[PDB]
Amino acid sequence: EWQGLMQFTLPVRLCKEIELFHFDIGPFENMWPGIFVYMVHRSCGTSCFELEKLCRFIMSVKKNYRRVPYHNWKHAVTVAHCMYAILQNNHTLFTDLERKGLLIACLCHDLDHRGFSNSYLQKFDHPLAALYSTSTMEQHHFSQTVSILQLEGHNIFSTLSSSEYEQVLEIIRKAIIATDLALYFGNRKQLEEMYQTGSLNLNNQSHRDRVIGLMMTACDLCSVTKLWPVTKLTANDIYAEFWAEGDEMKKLGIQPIPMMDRDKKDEVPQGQLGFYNAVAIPCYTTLTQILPPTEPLLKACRDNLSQWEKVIRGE
Ligand SMILES: Cn1ccc2ncnc(Oc3ccc(Nc4nc5ccccc5[nH]4)cc3)c21
Ligand SMILES: [Mg+2]
Ligand SMILES: [Zn+2]
16 A cells, blocks of 8 residues: 555646645545645655655554544545645745644544544543543544554654654644634634734744644635535535434434534524634634735635525525
């Protein structure tokens, strides 16, 4: 498996399209791992990692994604691609070590996701909720990454110094924890505060960490920044999984919130519009303000929002 991956070269007809924010990995399933290789080479250099160790890592990450409807291997690569495009349009603002870490983090941010929310696992007293009280799945996701890195021939940061190793693990740690949507609101409120007061300093490490946190959220939800046909199909995958979580509550004899209730299928468009306005728009809006080149994401988000309006209005 990892043998054929090293030989892979990306089709030339996709060299300029892959750089676009709205790029859809959808119809390139068996190219996905090589696409991640491509992106890492272009953003961090070809002589950044040993190819063998990197390919072993990608393949092990792949297999440790469960066959769930949304939080699966495809989602990982999609989030990784969004991050790539962000980093490519903001060349100088991020260090070499941050580029390596963030792309790895995006690929690993949902490792061994069971298809259940933190809310579900905490309610029903899951061993993972017993272990990690808050940001349950996210701490597991990172745990999983560490385990994979500590496998033989999988340590892709082996060439980095002892000091550089513990720095990139912290960058990875924070980026993955930040993908907990519950933490997003506080983060974005703080970043908006700093912008309008003009107290935002990118020399400030804790300010850097916050900006990165927002980038993680923006990449995580980047399905809303694709073209309407792609976005609509991704919406189907999210709800299929949400509804599967809903069914598991019904089997336990407990009625789930309408978001996860499949009998509330009609209220999906209204739920979507609400989500775009409350969560998606402010996200990409604040990100655009901090990183102006990321504007095509906001533009793309506005487009889809208006499409859900047409749905609600029946057009
Ligand atoms: C996580 N995620 C990543 C990308 C992405 N794209 C779209 N939706 C996402 O997640 C949701 C899904 C649903 C809701 N709300 C909701 N309210 C409802 C009320 C009734 C019925 C369904 C309802 N659904 C909010 C967020 C996405
Ligand atoms: Mg997650
Ligand atoms: Zn995710």
